[PDB]
């Protein structure tokens, strides 16, 4: 029927708590496939300088061998089942998930346990991963958007442990011994810091039984935003990359929805996007655009003018359009077993509960033009920003010019 009724149609995600602390969540559906994964509340933010690349290295070698079966055997079993075994690591989250058939739900869950509980850190495999990661860092150096975002994080958080990259420095990965990885696993991969989330054609009782069988052996038991800038000049690069951000509220904040609407509200730029990267207690709200050498200043002016217009003069039609865009993006994102499973895991990790879609719609409905402009002025207006520019960066206005453009003399 209506949008609200359709949201009510969405099945709930049953959540149970094991004895050791593991939080098992599921969302029953009629799909013949499923995606079962383990989300660990451990990331680059929790890593000191000694082991900045520990989590990434463990992500690399997790699928290359467990104690019960060698890495070749594990990969062969995954391939024979027809499933896809994938993993990712952010500065605050880690995840190992398996996209499989519903009838393969048991084995897959067991597999996850073998990946998490008893991980085999073969020294030869560790050296192979060292070589591979040393190659991979140089490979990733080509992608300038990720380099720009890493620059932005490093300059924005600096002294905070939130500024170090997920990959970690070359010297760190070179010297990252096996004992360091084992200590990282021991101190980090432990319930209740973990969530086993599944979606698709899965029954919550079956998932709970499998979690108790294979994930019951797990042991029972100041962020600061600095408005700095970084600009790496390289005129040989064809286009300049710019990412400018300001402090954003963490996961637990009602203002996130209004900021999402404002970003949705926001062509000189060849490719211009708006990001609202949220963390536990901090966040980066801003824009990333690619530019010609001769048009950086105009694009920065246009973006800051849009920011000021939202902060001061936010009309009702634009806010309604932003709310509709946000609703459509929210509903369309949660299409497919993998996206909903990832949402379940992350939401349990950050928000708690699962924040159903009806509450999201009600919160969006609360949002108003007055609310949009008030929150934008709260977070954007007259705030010292963090800027990251990858060459050719010469026409990019100096930090004082950008900071001055962060406010209006007419207002």
């Amino acid at each position: 029927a209506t949008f609200a009724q359709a949201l009510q149609f969405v099945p709930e995600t049953q959540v149970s708590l094991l004895d050791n602390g593991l939080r098992v969540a599921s969302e029953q559906s009629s799909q013949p496939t499923c995606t079962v994964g383990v989300w660990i509340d451990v990331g680059s933010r929790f890593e000191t300088e000694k082991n900045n690349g520990a989590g990434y290295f463990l992500e690399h070698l997790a699928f290359k061998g467990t104690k019960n079966r060698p890495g070749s055997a594990l990969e062969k079993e995954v391939e024979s089942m027809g499933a896809h075994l994938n993993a990712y690591s952010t500065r605050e989250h880690t995840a190992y998930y398996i996209k499989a058939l519903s009838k393969d739900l048991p084995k897959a869950v067991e597999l996850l346990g073998d990946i998490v509980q008893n991980c085999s850190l073969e020294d030869s495999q560790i050296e192979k991963e060292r070589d591979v990661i040393l190659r991979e860092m140089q490979e990733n150096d080509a992608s300038m958007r990720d380099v720009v975002f890493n620059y932005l994080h490093a300059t924005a958080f600096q002294g905070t442990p939130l500024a170090q990259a997920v990959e970690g420095p070359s010297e760190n990965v070179r010297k990252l011994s096996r004992a360091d990885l084992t200590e990282y696993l021991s101190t980090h991969y432990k319930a209740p810091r973990m969530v086993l989330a599944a979606a698709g054609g899965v029954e919550h009782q079956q998932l709970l039984d499998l979690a108790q069988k294979h994930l019951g052996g797990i042991p029972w038991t100041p962020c600061r935003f600095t408005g700095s800038e970084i600009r790496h000049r390289d005129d040989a690069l064809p286009f300049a990359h710019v990412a400018i951000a300001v402090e954003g509220p963490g996961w637990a904040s009602p203002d996130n929805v209004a900021l999402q609407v404002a970003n949705a509200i926001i062509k000189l730029c060849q490719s211009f996007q708006t990001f609202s990267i949220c963390y536990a207690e901090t966040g980066l709200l801003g824009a990333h655009f690619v530019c010609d050498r001769m048009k950086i200043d105009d694009m920065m002016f246009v973006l800051q003018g849009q920011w000021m217009r939202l902060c001061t003069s936010a009309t009702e039609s634009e806010v309604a359009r932003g709310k509709n865009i946000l609703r459509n993006a929210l509903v369309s994102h949660l299409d497919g077993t993998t996206p909903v499973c990832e949402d379940i895991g992350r939401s349990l990790l950050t928000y708690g509960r699962r924040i159903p879609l009806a509450e999201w719609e009600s919160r969006i409905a609360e949002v108003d033009a007055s609310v949009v402009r008030e929150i934008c002025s709260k977070y954007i207006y007259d705030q010292c920003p963090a800027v990251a520019g990858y060459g050719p960066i010469e026409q990019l206005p100096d930090y004082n010019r950008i900071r001055s453009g962060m406010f209006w003399l007419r207002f």
């Binding site: 029927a1 209506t2 949008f3 690399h60 995954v78 027809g82 499933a83 075994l85 299409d335």
Partner: protein, 418 residues
């Protein structure tokens, strides 16, 4: 609930589902594609899918864009060598406006010549960004070097046609191919009665057939693109069976025996025979897959390899040998079952996303007219036997090869050598 491929009297095959997802998704799949254009209007379809937002007879470009944005939905155009889909996604209560926009875009477009001229430079940028990944470029050269009549027509307009696509050609193509009998309307969130109503809005659509032509004749030609790239991408192929045939299922199971793609993050592809062979063939980084495309008139099963130039030949040779070994009959039963599991899982997992499910239903409606449930697809996959796979491998090995390569090309063998 289940779909029902109701066919309207004019010929418009209308199908509806009742997935209670808050986003209603509608899709108009026309049998028009790049194969249906010829040398006279080559590259017309590439601009045709970029003119979705142009002003129509019943709605203006500004009106279309602003209404679609304000509603929050999206209107996208997907194109392949046989079919063209207009997919519109909106909220449940916002179906009528975007459906009218879709009607205006497809049935009665008004290609204002100045708007078409302004849009034409976008062709260069779209072609360049789409050619950023080497796979698409090599596959385009492969289709140009394999077929000669219909499927050889590129998806992206040729460089010489970038600035000379007149609006008259667009009108001719639309009115000769966007006809009722060559189209299918599929609605996922939309309940069947309103889908019938919008189909009734579509009732007076052009005529009852189009200028379908050509047969996609096969040539054993090759295209070589001498570039300075350190990495070389090659793809050598042989004519497989048409789409929707048991032999097509055999070729797909064969490709999954050879190894279509990775299954473990940063995996070594232990099951993939091609990856294992090339690993001992060459030590530098590589990537080998069994390219397999199926069409109404013909098909193409082959090997795609990304390797170093100095090792290129070796790599492909190894890959070739693997298929030859399967052609000799060295195909066990365990890896066959593994490949069948891979194919079934891949199909079902692709069907998960509503976009891909809509695309699959639209393609089935266009080529069959009756929905094929996934259980029947799984049964057909299981029906394939080892002897059929051996026959498919023999057909690939014995057939005339067509190859397309790009890179340094200092060591890549030619078609006769391969």
């Amino acid at each position: 609930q289940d779909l029902e491929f109701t066919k309207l009297p004019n010929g418009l095959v209308i199908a509806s589902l009742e997935n209670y997802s808050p986003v209603s998704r509608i899709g108009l799949f026309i049998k028009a594609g790049s194969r249906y254009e010829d040398f006279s209007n080559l590259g017309t379809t590439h601009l045709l899918r970029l003119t979705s937002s142009l002003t129509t007879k019943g709605a203006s470009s500004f009106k279309i864009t602003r209404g679609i944005e304000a509603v929050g939905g999206k209107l996208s155009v997907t194109a392949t060598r046989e079919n063209m889909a207009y997919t519109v996604e909106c909220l449940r209560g916002d179906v009528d406006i975007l459906m009218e926009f879709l009607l205006n875009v497809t049935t009665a477009p008004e290609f204002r010549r100045w708007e078409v001229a302004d849009l034409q430079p976008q062709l260069k940028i779209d072609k360049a960004v789409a050619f950023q990944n080497p796979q698409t470029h090599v596959i385009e050269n492969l289709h140009a070097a394999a077929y000669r009549n219909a499927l050889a027509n590129p998806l992206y307009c040729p460089d010489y046609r970038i600035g000379k696509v007149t609006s008259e050609e667009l009108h001719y193509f639309v009115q000769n191919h966007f006809t009722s009998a060559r189209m299918a309307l599929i609605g996922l969130g939309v309940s069947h009665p309103v889908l019938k109503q919008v189909a009734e809005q579509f009732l007076n659509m052009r005529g009852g057939l189009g200028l379908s032509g050509a047969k996609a004749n096969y040539r054993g030609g090759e295209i070589r693109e001498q570039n300075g790239d350190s990495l070389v991408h090659a793809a050598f192929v042989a004519e497989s069976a048409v789409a929707g045939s048991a032999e097509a299922n055999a070729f797909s199971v064969l490709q999954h025996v050879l190894g279509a793609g990775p299954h473990v993050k940063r995996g070594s592809n232990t099951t993939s025979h091609l990856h294992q062979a090339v690993a001992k063939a060459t030590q530098q980084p590589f990537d080998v897959s069994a390219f397999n495309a199926s069409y109404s008139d013909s098909g193409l099963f082959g090997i795609y390899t990304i390797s170093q130039a100095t090792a290129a030949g070796d790599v492909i040779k190894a890959a070739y040998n693997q298929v030859k070994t399967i052609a000799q009959g060295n195909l066990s039963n365990t890896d066959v079952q593994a490949a069948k599991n891979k194919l079934k899982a891949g199909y079902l997992m692709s069907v998960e996303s509503s976009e891909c499910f809509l695309e699959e239903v639209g393609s089935q409606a266009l080529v069959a007219g009756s929905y094929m449930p996934p259980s029947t697809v799984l049964q057909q996959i299981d029906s394939v036997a080892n002897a059929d796979i051996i026959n498919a491998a023999k057909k690939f090995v014995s057939g005339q090869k067509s190859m397309a390569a790009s890179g340094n090309l200092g060591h890549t063998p030619f078609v006769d050598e391969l």
